[PDB]
Amino acid sequence: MLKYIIPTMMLMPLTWLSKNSMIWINTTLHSLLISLTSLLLLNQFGDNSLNFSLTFFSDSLSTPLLILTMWLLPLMLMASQHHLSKENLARKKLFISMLILLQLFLIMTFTATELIFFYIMFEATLVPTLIIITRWGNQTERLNAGLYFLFYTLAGSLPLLVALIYIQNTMGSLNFLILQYWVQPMPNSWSNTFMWLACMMAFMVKMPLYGLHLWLPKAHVEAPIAGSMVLAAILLKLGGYGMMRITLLLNPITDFMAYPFIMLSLWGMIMTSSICLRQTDLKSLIAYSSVSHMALVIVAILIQTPWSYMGATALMIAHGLTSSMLFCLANSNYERVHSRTMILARGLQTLLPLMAAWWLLASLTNLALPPSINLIGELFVVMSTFSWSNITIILMGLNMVITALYSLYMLITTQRGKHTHHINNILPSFTRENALMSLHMLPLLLLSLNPKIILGPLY
Amino acid sequence: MNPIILIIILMTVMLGTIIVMISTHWLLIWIGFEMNMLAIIPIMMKKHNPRATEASTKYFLTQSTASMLLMMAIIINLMFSGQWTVMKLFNPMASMLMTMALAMKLGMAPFHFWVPEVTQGIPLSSGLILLTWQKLAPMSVLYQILPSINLDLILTLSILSITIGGWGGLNQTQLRKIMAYSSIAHMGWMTAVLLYNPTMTLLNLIIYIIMTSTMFTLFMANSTTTTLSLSHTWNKAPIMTILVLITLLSMGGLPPLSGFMPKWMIIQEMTKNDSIILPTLMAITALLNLYFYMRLTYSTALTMFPSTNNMKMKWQFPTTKRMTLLPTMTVLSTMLLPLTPILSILE
Amino acid sequence: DAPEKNYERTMAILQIESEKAELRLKELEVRRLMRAKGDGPWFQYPTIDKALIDHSPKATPDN
């Protein structure tokens, strides 16, 4: 994995020694070269994972999240370069350095052989994201979110730390490869119940869980575009990756500890999708859509069937691409009308036809139009949860109505109807913006041809 | 103060700490603490204002009461053992009195009630000396008597120090009082792992001394004693706000910073000994000091501030203050976690 | 990489990590027994050097 970490670190002398008009071009070029390099991780096997060293490994779960992570950096550099034009050059290089450092943390978070190195890199990803959100977020009003981050630290990552140190003392190792063969059944006891909550609640907030999703339509709103792209595309999926690693140790107690949280997600995707029908803020609507889609990944991990893991990792990759494109479309209107109000600028297909085509395609991938991998992930999760319980199809299908309903409403409000009269700064689409939409959508459409590379280790 | 006399007095402070570190006889331990107190009293009264006289009087009374309790502990040791070796004690009453006396010298709770005041009244360099160098000698004596230290007393003092250092700094706008409640909390973190593994106690002591030295050196480099004057630093020197950012994030215990290194190891040495609840609630309380650090850097270090016109005069002059070891101490207080197995050199 | 290379590299990784995990559990047990009994080279808290004793004839005989 050291053929990826070292070029990502060499992006730091590349971004600090570059000429002042060249720092976007150079970082975009070399991060696209790293993303082309990232396809060497597709050397996967039907029995063995790709095990590089004592520190790094890659099965077919971590590999597509790595490719999506290394692909997300050039797109963030394209998306965030317009609204940093009047920024200081040194502050602009600090922004690019925090993006590069976040990629550096993520690409060795997903490959972490041992679980406390996963914990260190997992909680290391929060700091450059925090600095990007609070130094370039264009407004900061976080009176209620401070107490929620305190709740995240109390109920989340610290019990995970104590639990992983406990497994280190009990099993003697936290290597996931060793824990594949030295796993003991975790029986019914109160010690094992608090053990399960400690191993799971950090990743429950990171997904997020319904009821615990209070941070996500704030942190998505108060962020720049690169921060919202990396939150929607990668930083939610650390929770799902960590659940799919840590549920190896949590058998068979998961088979009766999943029942509350499954309810919290199965009803929760009914609520948040419905919440998207009453959103004034477009970026908040995409945030609650992200909650409504990660609820299915929570259910699919907690029911731990093969079809559910295949659908959950396909849904993670697909929703990463789709929701990142949705935030980029929301920014491509916000950079013109200077307000996130979804009822402000209407009828935009009269003014921007190709951009409305991109809105249509991102909406159709948002509502899981087949054969897109949004639908493949959605569908396999629905099949596995039907095998879990035959009634849940109702709570699936009703969600699959409301998921359609706000997806086209977001299309109908922003793009259709009568244009707003008093807005006359609606410029034509820059080639940068259309390139950003295409570099989201065309990989998402090409993955419908060959979905087997995004269906996880047990395809 | 005459610089020769200042050198002699600082060498006497160092000499008292050395006499406590090297001596085998309890009377010489007591002598080293007496020498250290007697020598440090003029360092606190360097500027000669009534706040320093109040701070020095309170420090004198606390360290003198602690020294008398230390000598009473030594004397009961002489009753029940007939000898004077600085080793384990031979009476639980001498153990309790010496643990109490060393807790008074460190400033641990419930004897914490001088550490925010005295550090407030004295300059930043003497507060640096108080919060770093004056921790070395009582931690050495606690390092040598740990076969006799009562576990319930040392854990009660430790968690009481951690809770009071956590909930005392939430209210604070003065930087010296934030450092003083941070001192009390870190001494709780050092003494709770003392009977389990004293090498991690030494690791916490050295990482704490590095981070505290970094913070007071940045404070002297910016001449800021309050939160609001610290907010006026970005318009003068922008890198200093970055350094107080990363060092305050390190002192609360963020990964992947170096100040996460000790306490994680401390939790790693408390679950080996089958204590789960105690390092759990201990780090729950450390989340509160990390949380007011994140308010004290989010609300009042990152997002840039209203300045004053006279600052535009101060743009025309560079810092001629001797920022001794400041880049080295800033690198070591942040970027040392990949070298976490260096701790074995303290075994 | 060949499947042979990944396979045998995985076996070497698993050997190293299994040896380290067994050694960590043995380190825990060794520290437990040496703290309990005090008969090993660890937890050797000092006592008084007996070379400090004056074995000369003293002023009075009965000692």
Binding site: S189, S191 | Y196, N273, I277 | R31, R32
Partner: peptide, 27 residues
């Protein structure tokens, strides 16, 4: 009503499963 009850449940399960808060040093 919440934290007192959760704490009393934790003390009950510390009685049951044998949770040590002032645990004796063993290693």
């Amino acid at each position: 009503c919440a934290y007192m009850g959760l704490t009393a449940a934790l003390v009950k399960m510390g009685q049951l499963e044998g949770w040590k808060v002032f645990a004796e040093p063993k290693v």
